[PDB]
Each structure stands twice: as structure tokens, then as C-alpha cells.
């Protein structure tokens, strides 16, 4: 209900650390492929944790 949101801006996005953090029950990506993420540059990334 009080899900945490962190705004991400002005930094380099190293998704490899996200990939290797733990075994994941789901890593479903909607509207973007997982591989292209490193070669893509986005204006803002929002991380929501709950």
C-alpha cells in the first residue's frame, strides 16, 4: 500500500548488477526487451519496491 518509489536520474544504468543479484521468479519486461536496455538511454528510471 505504501510502496516505495525512488527516482533515478543523472547516472549510468548498470543493469548487470540487477541481473546477478538473486535468482528471480519473474523478470518479465513489458514494452522493452531485456537485452536492449543497456544500449538504450532513458530520461528517467523509476524503481518501485514492495
Amino acid at each position: 500500500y505504501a510502496w516505495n518509489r525512488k527516482r533515478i536520474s543523472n547516472c549510468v544504468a548498470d543493469y548487470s548488477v540487477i541481473y546477478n543479484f538473486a535468482p528471480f521468479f519473474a523478470f518479465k519486461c513489458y514494452g522493452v526487451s531485456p537485452t536492449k536496455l543497456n544500449d538504450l538511454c532513458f530520461t528517467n528510471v523509476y524503481a518501485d519496491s514492495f
Binding site: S16, Y19, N20, P23, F24, F27, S33, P34, T35
Partner: protein
Amino acid sequence: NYLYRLFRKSKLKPFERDISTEIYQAGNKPCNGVAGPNCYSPLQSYGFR
């Protein structure tokens, strides 16, 4: 019933069909042909409703 190829190593040539149902390595770790985190099946079905 309708599936699309989400993952491939390289772009296809014009008028070329790829029907190979082989696993793709999306992560630095080798998949070794078994599904795992960082390993995904290339072909996904559309959710048509």
C-alpha cells in the same frame, strides 16, 4: 496460437524466415540450453482477446 520471436542474436535478412526454437543467451552466464534467470525463450505468444 500466434507467436513472435522476441529474441535473436542478429537481425534477419529480407524475405528470410527463422523457425529455430533454440534458447537465447540474454545474460553473461551461459544458459547451457536450460531456462534460468537471464535466459529467455525467444518465441512468445500474443495475448489476443
